Amino acid sequence: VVGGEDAKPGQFPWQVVLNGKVDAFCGGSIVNEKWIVTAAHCVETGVKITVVAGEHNIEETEHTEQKRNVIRIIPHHNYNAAINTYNHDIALLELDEPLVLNSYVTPICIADKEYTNIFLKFGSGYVSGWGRVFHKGRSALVLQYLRVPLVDRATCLRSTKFTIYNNMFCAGFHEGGRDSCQGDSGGPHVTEVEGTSFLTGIISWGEECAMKGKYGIYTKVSRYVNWIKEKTKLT
Amino acid sequence: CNIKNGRCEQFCKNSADNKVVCSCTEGYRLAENQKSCEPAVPFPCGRVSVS
Ligand SMILES: *C[C@@](*)(O)[C@H](CCCNC(N)=[NH2+])NC(=O)[C@@H]1CCCN1C(=O)[C@H](N)Cc1ccccc1
Numbered sequence: 001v002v003g004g005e006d007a008k009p010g011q012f013p014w015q016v017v018l019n020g021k022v023d024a025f026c027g028g029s030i031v032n033e034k035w036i037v038t039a040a041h042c043v044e045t046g047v048k049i050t051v052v053a054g055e056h057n058i059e060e061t062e063h064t065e066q067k068r069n070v071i072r073i074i075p076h077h078n079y080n081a082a083i084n085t086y087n088h089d090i091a092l093l094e095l096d097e098p099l100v101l102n103s104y105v106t107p108i109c110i111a112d113k114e115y116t117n118i119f120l121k122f123g124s125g126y127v128s129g130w131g132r133v134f135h136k137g138r139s140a141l142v143l144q145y146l147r148v149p150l151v152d153r154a155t156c157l158r159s160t161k162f163t164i165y166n167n168m169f170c171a172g173f174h175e176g177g178r179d180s181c182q183g184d185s186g187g188p189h190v191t192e193v194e195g196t197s198f199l200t201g202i203i204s205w206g207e208e209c210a211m212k213g214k215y216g217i218y219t220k221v222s223r224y225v226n227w228i229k230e231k232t233k234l235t
Numbered sequence: 236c237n238i239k240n241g242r243c244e245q246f247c248k249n250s251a252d253n254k255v256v257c258s259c260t261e262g263y264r265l266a267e268n269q270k271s272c273e274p275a276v277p278f279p280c281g282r283v284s285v286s
């Protein structure tokens with residue numbers, strides 16, 4: 001996250017970090033004690049991944065961290081149906097052993113399709129992660145967060161040569177300087193509703209980071225909530 | 236549900252006689268006032284409890 005601020009411990013207790021052949025390569029959010037939602041482009045390979053919930057400072061010990069192994073990965077079935085479009089950039093990770101919920105390890109709420117879209121259109125959401133704190137720069141030690149404005153569809157279409165699908169939205173500032181970035185993918189875009197946070201997007205892609213005239217591109221979670229709820233059932 | 240979500244803290248659905256029915260997400264229950272949502276589990280989703 002470029003141009004953000006340090007989170008306090010427990011401020012985003014649904015946030016997780018993913019570790020594997022690279023440290024802190026992506027984020028995710030807790031759906032429930034057995035399931036994480038992230039970006040499909042973080043987990044394309046099937047190579048071994050671990051999840052750390054209750055993380056704050058990735059070079060220190062807080063004694064709040066819960067480490068789990070990933071035993072199943074479900075990319076959305078239409079991800080990579082087309083090449084390099086980043087459409088349907090969303091995936092679910094099943095954990096080997098349940099997380100123990102507490103003040104540092106808490107799920108994000110997920111509304112139905114209608115209300116997730118209503119919450120997005122409120123027009124102000126928070127993104128968080130341990131990704132780069134400058135374009136082409138170092139990753140964060142302390143979890144970062146940033147409020148980003150929703151950007152109108154026409155403006156976003158004009159900002160880029162890419163296609164912005166219906167399954168995506170754009171968020172960020174007209175003057176640049178503040179954005180999600182490499183390493184943040186898979187983490188949450190969330191909307192606070194009377195003190196209760198709801199998942200409204202997945203950090204997905206962009207062109208460099210924080211450049212004026214560019215916006216962060218996010219997976220629109222409203223279009224995927226039925227699939228998330230179907231696949232993450234506990235019994 | 237038209238103005239201010241029917242005064243529902245979370246979810247609103249329209250019902251006959253232009254009344255509304257409020258509801259809440261998993262981990263919460265609809266409170267006595269039929270509008271607010273209160274926690275029904277120790278660590279409901281989406282809430283900061285470290286503070
Ligand atoms: C995997 C995620 O960490 C990362 C998030 C980047 C978010 N960027 C901003 N500005 N909010 N996503 C990616 O790395 C995705 C998937 C692979 C390619 N990609 C990109 O964001 C590229 N930068 C897209 C691209 C742009 C120009 C030319 C080629 C590719």
Ligand SMILES: [Ca+2]
Pocket residue numbers: 055056057058059060061062065
């Ligand atoms: Ca730590």
